[PDB]
RNA sequence: ACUAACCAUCUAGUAGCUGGUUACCGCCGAAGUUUCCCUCAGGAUAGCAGUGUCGACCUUCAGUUUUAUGAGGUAAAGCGAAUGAACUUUAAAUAUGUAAGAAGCCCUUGUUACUUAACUGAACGUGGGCAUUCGAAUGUAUCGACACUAGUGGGCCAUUUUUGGUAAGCAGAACUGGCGAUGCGGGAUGAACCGAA
RNA sequence: CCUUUAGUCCCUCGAAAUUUGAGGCUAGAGGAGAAAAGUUACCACAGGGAUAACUGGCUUGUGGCGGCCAAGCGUAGCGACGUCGCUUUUUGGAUGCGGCUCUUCCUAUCAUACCG
């Protein structure tokens, strides 16, 4: 067994894109993770596979849910984010 | 040298007894011609093995770091020598201690 | 130096550059040349085996290698036998073409005045 | 499979080699002291300890500032 | 027997033990009857051995 | 909702592993190895042995010596030669590569799409020269090419050369020899010793 | 950009007074690039190669190291017996297969015999 990073294996287009992918051997650019919505949403989602098999169904859809809120804030933060450096 | 300490995993499986461990050796200081019993600060280079370096084998021809303090030795500046090079000589496994002789 | 395809050249193995470094077996070896490059050479070697001779190829630069003279001394001996040939005939009168293992020597007198023999000892003491 | 066919195939050159390269590292160490102690007979011009640093670059240090 | 002694004995012709042969001095075949020397015994016979 | 025992047969199931495998005499007779591919219960090429066909005739050939010339200038003599293993007129011992003919060397001028300032060079051809020692010795139990076929792919010991190491052992490379498939005499006896097949 | 090396005792800053430290100069040495790369007598797992027992005129009562002396070998190096220095001095538990019976042998003898 090797892995598929040591192969040099493409990246195959299905139902989850594959995006802009980067060049190999080049400068892939680092995006950091500071904002305190940003470690929210990387933490809710860990929590969600940590925490992982529920029977109750309105506590599986409220985890949901505040994943699905933790990135609404994140888009609505970056968008903000985005207007202000646009215009000031 | 310490007593109690911990080592790295690296080499914490490693064991050295109390009946193999030295303290101090016979060092001869050639030109004040006297050999005087001096303690063992550090072991520098044994010249067979980077591990035995590592672990403080003493071995023949084996350079370590001993305290001369008490020979007197006057440097250029005016000071007193607390420290020198001194080569192993001996076989201490064969023979129950460690003979140095001093390099000055 | 100029070398072309077809010659016969020795191997010195200087240590001056170790850049195309044979090996002690190569070294002080004699063979013809069979390839040549922008500046090793391929040289055709005759290798020993353990109870037979192969051929081996090896690939030895400009440094190491130069010309041999064995055939020059081979040439030299068919142009001295042709001349000596030719002037034999026009002479009339017969010449050994042919060259002799080296005879024993014949026999001969030596005088022993103002060349007295010296008595030795086994040992010079002195 | 073709490096490890190589590897099985000079296995034992290896060993041999490594034993011999450690023998000559041997060699090189103790002429290196012999030199050390027969500069420090010559002459020298220290101070109270020895260099904190380590022995080979120490050793080095020393005949080269002669 | 080493190989140079073994051909050079083929080709003095000493095939088997006690195979003594006649050969014409020179320098060449002395040389070879000086290396073959531990193998053969050789000298300058007369008139009578001839 | 889901997914034991014995009898006969398929079955003479599947093995690369074990054991065994049937008269005599004669002739010829090994290998334990190079290289390539690939991770096997390994293949391919070459080698040793043999058969057939084709070409010549000791033609030729050769684990050899000699001559010539390399890698070893290694020892030695001298410095009333110069200079100073690193000096040399000279030059050891010792093994070792190559060459020694018609399968030759040249010289001469016709062509070429190559090349050159140019019929100028190189290649392709012509003429000549030696057929009697045709261009060292000794041997020669022939040699070469193609095609095909079988058994082999292990090593142990020792001499010499050499690398390293130990307190001493010892470890590793090259050649050669012995033993494998070898009887016989000798060493009281015997894998490794001596003589000799 | 700092650090080291040798030099003129050539210049600035800081300190102390009857001298220093840090910089400055001459020219050697150290530090395609945020994707990853190099390296280790080290550890863990997995795998490969070599080696596969081993001692067998072996073993016993007198240490090792450095100096001095040292017949010689040699024409610097090897070097015994001693002596000096360290261990080492001016007042008196270790151990982590065992045990018992019988035969015979060894002497490196505890007793008995005889001796100095």
């Known amino acids: ?88 | 040298g310490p007593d109690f300490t911990r080592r790295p995993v690296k080499y914490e499986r490693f064991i050295r007894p109390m009946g193999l461990r030295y303290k101090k050796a016979n060092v001869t200081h050639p030109t004040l011609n006297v050999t005087v019993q001096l303690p063992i600060l550090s072991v520098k280079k044994n010249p067979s093995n980077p591990l035995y370096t590592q672990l403080g084998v003493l071995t023949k021809g084996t350079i370590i770091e001993v305290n001369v303090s008490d020979l007197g030795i006057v440097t250029a500046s005016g000071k007193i020598a607390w420290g020198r090079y001194a080569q192993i000589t001996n076989n201490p496994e064969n023979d129950g201690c460690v003979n140095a002789v001093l390099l000055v | 130096r100029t070398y072309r395809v077809g010659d016969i050249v020795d191997i010195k193995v200087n240590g001056a550059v170790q850049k195309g470094m044979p090996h002690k077996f190569y070294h002080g070896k004699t063979g013809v040349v069979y390839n040549v490059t922008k500046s090793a050479v391929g040289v055709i070697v005759y290798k020993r085996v353990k109870h037979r001779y192969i051929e081996k190829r090896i690939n030895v630069r400009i440094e190491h290698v130069k010309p041999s003279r064995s055939r020059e001394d081979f040439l030299r001996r068919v142009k001295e036998n042709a001349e000596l040939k030719k002037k034999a005939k026009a002479e009339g009168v017969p010449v050994q073409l042919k060259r002799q293992p080296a005879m024993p020597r014949e026999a001969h007198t030596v005088s022993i005045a103002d060349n007295k023999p010296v008595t030795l000892a086994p040992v010079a003491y002195e | 499979a073709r490096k490890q066919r190589d590897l099985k195939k000079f296995g034992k050159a290896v060993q041999v080699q490594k034993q011999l390269e450690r023998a000559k590292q041997k060699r090189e160490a103790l002429d290196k002291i012999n030199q050390l102690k027969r500069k420090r007979a010559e002459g020298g011009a220290l101070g109270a300890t020895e260099a904190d640093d380590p022995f080979d670059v120490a050793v080095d240090n020393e005949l080269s500032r002669d | 027997i080493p190989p140079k002694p073994r051909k050079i004995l083929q080709l003095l012709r000493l095939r088997q033990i006690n195979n003594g042969v006649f050969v014409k001095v020179t320098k060449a075949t002395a040389e070879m009857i000086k290396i073959v020397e531990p193998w053969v015994a050789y000298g300058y016979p007369n008139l009578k051995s001839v």
């Open chain 1, 1 to 88: 067994v090797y892995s598929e990073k040591e192969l040099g294996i493409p990246q195959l287009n299905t139902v989850t894109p594959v995006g802009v992918t980067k060049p190999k051997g080049k400068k892939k650019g680092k995006v950091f993770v500071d904002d305190r919505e940003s470690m929210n949403t990387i933490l809710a989602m860990v929590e969600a596979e940590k925490q992982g098999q529920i029977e109750s169904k309105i506590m599986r859809a409220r985890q949901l849910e505040e994943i699905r809120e933790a990135r609404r804030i994140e888009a609505e933060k970056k968008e903000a984010e985005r207007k202000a450096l646009l215009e000031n």
